[PDB]
Design a protein around this ligand. Structure first.
Ligand SMILES: [K+]
Ligand SMILES: [K+]
Ligand SMILES: [K+]
Ligand SMILES: [K+]
Ligand SMILES: [K+]
Ligand SMILES: [K+]
Ligand SMILES: [K+]
Ligand SMILES: [K+]
Ligand SMILES: [K+]
Ligand SMILES: [K+]
Ligand SMILES: [K+]
Ligand SMILES: [K+]
Ligand SMILES: [K+]
Ligand SMILES: [K+]
Ligand SMILES: [K+]
Ligand SMILES: [K+]
Ligand SMILES: [K+]
Ligand SMILES: [K+]
Ligand SMILES: [K+]
Ligand SMILES: [K+]
Ligand SMILES: [K+]
Ligand SMILES: [K+]
Ligand SMILES: [K+]
Ligand SMILES: [K+]
Ligand SMILES: [K+]
Ligand SMILES: [K+]
Ligand SMILES: [K+]
Ligand SMILES: [K+]
Ligand SMILES: [K+]
Ligand SMILES: [K+]
Ligand SMILES: [Mg+2]
Ligand SMILES: [Mg+2]
Ligand SMILES: [Mg+2]
Ligand SMILES: [Mg+2]
Ligand SMILES: [Mg+2]
Ligand SMILES: [Mg+2]
Ligand SMILES: [Mg+2]
Ligand SMILES: [Mg+2]
Ligand SMILES: [Mg+2]
Ligand SMILES: [Mg+2]
Ligand SMILES: [Mg+2]
Ligand SMILES: [Mg+2]
Ligand SMILES: [Mg+2]
Ligand SMILES: [Mg+2]
Ligand SMILES: [Mg+2]
Ligand SMILES: [Mg+2]
Ligand SMILES: [Mg+2]
Ligand SMILES: [Mg+2]
Ligand SMILES: [Mg+2]
Ligand SMILES: [Mg+2]
Ligand SMILES: [Mg+2]
Ligand SMILES: [Mg+2]
Ligand SMILES: [Mg+2]
Ligand SMILES: [Mg+2]
Ligand SMILES: [Mg+2]
Ligand SMILES: [Mg+2]
Ligand SMILES: [Mg+2]
Ligand SMILES: [Mg+2]
Ligand SMILES: [Mg+2]
Ligand SMILES: [Mg+2]
Ligand SMILES: [Mg+2]
Ligand SMILES: [Mg+2]
Ligand SMILES: [Mg+2]
Ligand SMILES: [Mg+2]
Ligand SMILES: [Mg+2]
Ligand SMILES: [Mg+2]
Ligand SMILES: [Mg+2]
Ligand SMILES: [Mg+2]
Ligand SMILES: [Mg+2]
Ligand SMILES: [Mg+2]
Ligand SMILES: [Mg+2]
Ligand SMILES: [Mg+2]
Ligand SMILES: [Mg+2]
Ligand SMILES: [Mg+2]
Ligand SMILES: [Mg+2]
Ligand SMILES: [Mg+2]
Ligand SMILES: [Mg+2]
Ligand SMILES: [Mg+2]
Ligand SMILES: [Mg+2]
Ligand SMILES: [Mg+2]
Ligand SMILES: [Mg+2]
Ligand SMILES: [Mg+2]
Ligand SMILES: [Mg+2]
Ligand SMILES: [Mg+2]
Ligand SMILES: [Mg+2]
Ligand SMILES: [Mg+2]
Ligand SMILES: [Mg+2]
Ligand SMILES: [Mg+2]
Ligand SMILES: [Mg+2]
Ligand SMILES: [Mg+2]
Ligand SMILES: [Mg+2]
Ligand SMILES: [Mg+2]
Ligand SMILES: [Mg+2]
Ligand SMILES: [Mg+2]
Ligand SMILES: [Mg+2]
Ligand SMILES: [Mg+2]
Ligand SMILES: [Mg+2]
Ligand SMILES: [Mg+2]
Ligand SMILES: [Mg+2]
Ligand SMILES: [Mg+2]
Ligand SMILES: [Mg+2]
Ligand SMILES: [Mg+2]
Ligand SMILES: [Mg+2]
Ligand SMILES: [Mg+2]
Ligand SMILES: [Mg+2]
Ligand SMILES: [Mg+2]
Ligand SMILES: [Mg+2]
Ligand SMILES: [Mg+2]
Ligand SMILES: [Mg+2]
Ligand SMILES: [Mg+2]
Ligand SMILES: [Mg+2]
Ligand SMILES: [Mg+2]
Ligand SMILES: [Mg+2]
Ligand SMILES: [Mg+2]
Ligand SMILES: [Zn+2]
Lengths: 83, 99, 104, 208
RNA sequence: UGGAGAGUUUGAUCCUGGCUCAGGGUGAACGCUGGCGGCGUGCCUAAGACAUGCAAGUCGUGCGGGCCGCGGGGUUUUACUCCGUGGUCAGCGGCGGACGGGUGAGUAACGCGUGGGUGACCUACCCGGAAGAGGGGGACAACCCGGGGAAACUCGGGCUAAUCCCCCAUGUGGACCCGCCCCUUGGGGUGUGUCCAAAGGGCUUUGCCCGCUUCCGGAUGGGCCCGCGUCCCAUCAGCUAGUUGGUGGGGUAAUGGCCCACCAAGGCGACGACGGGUAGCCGGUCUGAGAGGAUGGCCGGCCACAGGGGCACUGAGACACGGGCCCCACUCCUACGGGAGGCAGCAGUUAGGAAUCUUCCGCAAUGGGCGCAAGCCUGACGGAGCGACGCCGCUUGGAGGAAGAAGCCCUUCGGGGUGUAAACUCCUGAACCCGGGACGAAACCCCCGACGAGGGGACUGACGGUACCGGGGUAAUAGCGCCGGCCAACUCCGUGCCAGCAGCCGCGGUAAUACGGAGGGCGCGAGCGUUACCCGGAUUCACUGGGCGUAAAGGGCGUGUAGGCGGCCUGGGGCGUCCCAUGUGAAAGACCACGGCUCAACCGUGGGGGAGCGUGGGAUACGCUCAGGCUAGACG
């Protein structure tokens, strides 16, 4: 199915993923359907994680299945917080 | 020296025979129906047409015909039968043909 | 949207089919000069309604046959063989440019 | 590679005084002060009317040989200058002047540029606290270039910074002889620099 | 925010004109030389042939067994037999094997690009909504028994489970025929008739989880169609019979000569058909002031192929690289009947070549398949290794040192040069040695909470004892091309149209700045040169931006077809043209800004653009078109 996952973009030893909506079958660094955030695992800057939670919720509402790591990141940015 | 997925080949062969058979039936009866209708035998021809219709929809239950393939067959069948009948007429058993 | 083209019926020796000559103009990509190239389309005419010399609109359609993806939308202006003429002649000159016979 | 070799011969060929030695270049031993003619077996012969090319070549070679930069690095800076907005010539000189190894020389932490280079490579320098040992590191307006604390007690830094007590510092800089540090106030304006170089000819050399 | 020219035809000149040089670039190779690191990059030739290992499986929460083992029962005991459990093995069954990875052979084509169409369509898993799962029957492996073969493997008999197959029922609904309604290509609705459903498993077991069936919709992915664009040769000019169209069928998810009957006789072409050559296309890339030229390697998108040719089966999907069948070529096995195989996956071998790497580490991370999960698989990937192949960063030292050692080189024999260069003096202190030592990793899972939201805890690092921080600490790689002009850099000796140089002009036949060496000098520097190739200069195919009296170039002349071009005034239209809004113009790249590695290369975030095309609206001077008028062109 279509998914919400991480696409790798930094450089060797300098990883920077892009939280992305893509078909599950596409190569990971291939043509995605939409970018909905980004993530720097080494928090090299105060802004190491951004997520368009209004958009995340949209795809989640249409079947997009997040990776366990993508889900972890989306949660951190209050994607599932219903409080 | 290889992949135990040779299994898919075994399965395919059974599935193949299973399909081939369901279809042979469909065709045979389909003709039978068209033939009876062509000969004016209404009650008789409709009677068989329903089996055909049923066998077709059934073939579509699984992956034999599935799709709009059944639809296509049922259609072409009921058309040829309804038309061949009308050339003598009188749809007796009013089998599958709607009023 | 289904592309619509206007042209002249130059042939109708086919059943439920007419040949429409559609011209177009545009700036030569390197030389600017507005040049005028053209193309023929085999359009669907089920009623055999259109005759040689009619300027018709043609509309992108679902395939009717190979070499035939257009249907005559409507008649723009009736009879006017002056156009059919250019065509016929432009084709006739072809004889006079090969190795065989022809006309000047 | 940064050259490494007889530096006074470079003054002799360019005919002008470059200070690739700091002291001694102010002393009657400067060679330029007693042999202003080109090096080699023909230095005393009659110079021939230079070619438009030669003139531009010699002029650029002078400016580059001043900062001890490689033709490679040198060329890349000029191209970067040419890209940026504003008079290329000045922007070029601003960039050349924003090189830490040069700034360390301007603040008198070192007698020469080639010495300030080594002071950087060997960590004796710092930029905003964190140390930097890249001669080419580019100082920006607002940064503070100081001496390494662990180095503040070096026979060489003692002399150099002592001699600074009294001397003035470029309008674009500002030394603090006590705390052994200074600041890069802003990119030097063409006027601030008084180099024996016609940057106009340089821009032309790379125009060919 | 952007545009340099020079050498060479002559005794000299101006012009025409070719040739050549200076710049930038490359998946490079070759020569001399070669120290460190980061990032990137590396069979351009034989789509030649390939040893070996690995490269796609996974579910015991779908099912029944075999083998090995332990335990517990029924009996007075043995025997025989029942149950529980561990390991293992395949089998039946499911989902995946149509992705991911490779290559560029073929292809000049709806293949690709850009913009559209589908009332002519499909889409497994995922999401939302509605409804449902009553009863019955059966077979084939496994296993058991027997025959055949050298092997591969095969034939027969017998038993058996299921989420395997079938039958009846239920009909939310859906399909088909006919009719009616709306709508307009086969879209939506409605009525009668007919036809069509399902599967169970797990439990913390009576309430949840995983799953099943039918239908409507979403989402993603895809098929087919159309406009425009897409190299060279006209020393390729005619091409065509399924050919072009029609009616009726077949086929498909679906349109269509896609295929087939029958009827018609058409279709295409100088606006380049047909043929021949060459070639995957694109985002982009290199170059250029631009216009343009050249190009398509890495990365991303699409296509095609998987030893060569053809074919279908299975399936949501394939005509299927590690699936199947046949023919062909080749390699291997063969008890000669007959079998086995396909690295354009990773690594490696061999051949060819000027030339292109490790049979490495890991599954820790990102991504993928199966699984409720634990977890398994993953040569995808994340890393490391090799090669200055490229880019960036860095070192071989810093300061002081003689009106200036020696040696060497010139000399007017006075002296001049190598040169503050060296030796020395002091300072720092790459390498190296110690100590510490990382981010990348928090989820999955468990507990609480409701298996949610929320909260809490635990595990996990290939790279690697690497980066980096701290301490100690040696003064310690430099080469290559060039020096007649273009072109920056000059002298002695040697050689004597020789040996040789040479990019073009040319140089050497006794005093050569041009050959060879030396001293000196210019350039660049872990590089420097050379060869090859692309753009440039070359306004030298000239659209921007050229020419034809004598330099190359007017057709021997006319008549005239197509085509190109078209006087003055008014009106309609609004095709060209122009304007506005809007959609499209992926990401990467490019530009600007800020930011992360000490800098930079590299990388992240953000911003700004953009031609072209679609849609809606508008303008009407010019061009076009239609209608009317005129007489200055033309004709009479
Ligand atoms: K949805
Ligand atoms: K089946
Ligand atoms: K003809
Ligand atoms: K090879
Ligand atoms: K096609
Ligand atoms: K048995
Ligand atoms: K059996
Ligand atoms: K009904
Ligand atoms: K659906
Ligand atoms: K769709
Ligand atoms: K579509
Ligand atoms: K047909
Ligand atoms: K231009
Ligand atoms: K091109
Ligand atoms: K091209
Ligand atoms: K291009
Ligand atoms: K799962
Ligand atoms: K939780
Ligand atoms: K240290
Ligand atoms: K030394
Ligand atoms: K001699
Ligand atoms: K001579
Ligand atoms: K010489
Ligand atoms: K020489
Ligand atoms: K050229
Ligand atoms: K002539
Ligand atoms: K002639
Ligand atoms: K008008
Ligand atoms: K460009
Ligand atoms: K537009
Ligand atoms: Mg299996
Ligand atoms: Mg039969
Ligand atoms: Mg007709
Ligand atoms: Mg057209
Ligand atoms: Mg500038
Ligand atoms: Mg000449
Ligand atoms: Mg000459
Ligand atoms: Mg010339
Ligand atoms: Mg002459
Ligand atoms: Mg001459
Ligand atoms: Mg230039
Ligand atoms: Mg070597
Ligand atoms: Mg490397
Ligand atoms: Mg190759
Ligand atoms: Mg093998
Ligand atoms: Mg493996
Ligand atoms: Mg098993
Ligand atoms: Mg692929
Ligand atoms: Mg390749
Ligand atoms: Mg190819
Ligand atoms: Mg061809
Ligand atoms: Mg298209
Ligand atoms: Mg559609
Ligand atoms: Mg559902
Ligand atoms: Mg049963
Ligand atoms: Mg046997
Ligand atoms: Mg049996
Ligand atoms: Mg019903
Ligand atoms: Mg209806
Ligand atoms: Mg109905
Ligand atoms: Mg009934
Ligand atoms: Mg039923
Ligand atoms: Mg249960
Ligand atoms: Mg049809
Ligand atoms: Mg059909
Ligand atoms: Mg055909
Ligand atoms: Mg003909
Ligand atoms: Mg090819
Ligand atoms: Mg140009
Ligand atoms: Mg450019
Ligand atoms: Mg360009
Ligand atoms: Mg690519
Ligand atoms: Mg091969
Ligand atoms: Mg499937
Ligand atoms: Mg099928
Ligand atoms: Mg396969
Ligand atoms: Mg294929
Ligand atoms: Mg293979
Ligand atoms: Mg060889
Ligand atoms: Mg993994
Ligand atoms: Mg994973
Ligand atoms: Mg001496
Ligand atoms: Mg010294
Ligand atoms: Mg120290
Ligand atoms: Mg010391
Ligand atoms: Mg794990
Ligand atoms: Mg629990
Ligand atoms: Mg609980
Ligand atoms: Mg939690
Ligand atoms: Mg010179
Ligand atoms: Mg002699
Ligand atoms: Mg000789
Ligand atoms: Mg001589
Ligand atoms: Mg000379
Ligand atoms: Mg020379
Ligand atoms: Mg040109
Ligand atoms: Mg011109
Ligand atoms: Mg000319
Ligand atoms: Mg002439
Ligand atoms: Mg003449
Ligand atoms: Mg004439
Ligand atoms: Mg004419
Ligand atoms: Mg006019
Ligand atoms: Mg005209
Ligand atoms: Mg218009
Ligand atoms: Mg636009
Ligand atoms: Mg873009
Ligand atoms: Mg920075
Ligand atoms: Mg960006
Ligand atoms: Mg525009
Ligand atoms: Mg418009
Ligand atoms: Mg108007
Ligand atoms: Mg008008
Ligand atoms: Mg008129
Ligand atoms: Zn000096």
């Amino acid at each position: 199915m279509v998914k919400i996952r991480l696409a790798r973009f930094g450089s060797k030893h300098n990883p920077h993923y892009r939280i992305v909506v893509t078909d599950a079958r596409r190569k990971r660094d291939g043509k995605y359907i939409e970018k909905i955030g980004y993530y720097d695992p080494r928090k090299t800057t105060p802004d190491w994680l951004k997520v368009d939670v209004e958009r995340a919720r949209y795809w989640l509402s249409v079947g997009a299945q997040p990776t366990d790591t993508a889900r972890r990141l989306l949660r951190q940015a209050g994607v599932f917080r219903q409080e | 020296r290889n992949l135990s997925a040779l299994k898919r080949h075994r399965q395919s062969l059974k599935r193949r025979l299973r399909n081939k058979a369901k279809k042979s039936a469909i065709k045979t009866l389909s003709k039978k129906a068209v033939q009876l209708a062509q000969e004016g035998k209404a009650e008789e021809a409709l009677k068989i047409m329903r089996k055909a219709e049923s066998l077709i929809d059934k073939a579509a239950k699984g992956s034999t015909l599935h799709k709009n393939a059944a639809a296509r067959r049922k259609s072409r069948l009921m058309r040829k039968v309804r038309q061949l009948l009308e050339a003598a007429g009188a749809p007796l058993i009013g089998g599958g043909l709607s009023a | 949207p289904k592309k619509v083209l206007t042209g002249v019926v130059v042939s109708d020796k086919m059943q439920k089919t007419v040949t429409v000559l559609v011209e177009r103009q545009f700036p030569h990509p390197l030389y600017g000069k507005v040049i005028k190239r053209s193309k023929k389309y085999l359009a669907h005419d089920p009623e055999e309604k259109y005759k040689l010399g009619d300027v018709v609109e043609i509309i992108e359609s679902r395939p009717i046959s190979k070499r035939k993806r257009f249907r005559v939308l409507r008649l723009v202006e009736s009879g006017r063989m002056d156009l059919v003429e250019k065509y016929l002649i432009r084709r006739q000159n072809y004889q006079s440019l090969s190795k065989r016979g022809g006309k000047a | 590679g940064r050259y490494i070799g007889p530096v006074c011969r470079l003054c002799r060929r360019e005919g002008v005084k470059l200070y690739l030695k700091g002291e001694r270049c102010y002393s009657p031993k400067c060679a330029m002060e007693r042999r202003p003619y080109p090096p080699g077996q023909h230095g005393q012969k009659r110079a021939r009317r230079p070619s438009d090319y030669a003139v531009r070549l010699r002029e650029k070679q002078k400016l580059r040989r001043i900062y001890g930069i490689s033709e490679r690095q040198f060329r890349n800076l000029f191209e970067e200058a040419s890209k940026k907005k504003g008079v290329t010539g000045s922007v070029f000189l601003g960039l050349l002047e924003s090189r830490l190894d040069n700034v360390v020389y301007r603040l008198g932490f070192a007698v020469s540029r080639r010495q300030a280079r080594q002071l950087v490579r060997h960590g004796h320098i710092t930029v905003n606290g964190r140390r930097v040992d890249l001669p080419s590191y580019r100082v920006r307006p607002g940064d503070e270039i100081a001496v390494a604390e662990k180095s503040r007690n070096l026979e060489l830094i003692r002399q150099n910074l002592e001699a600074m007590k009294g001397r003035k510092v470029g309008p674009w800089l500002s030394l603090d002889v006590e705390g052994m540090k200074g600041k890069f106030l802003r990119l030097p304006d063409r006027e601030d620099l008084a180099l024996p170089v016609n940057e106009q000819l340089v821009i032309e050399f790379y125009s060919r």
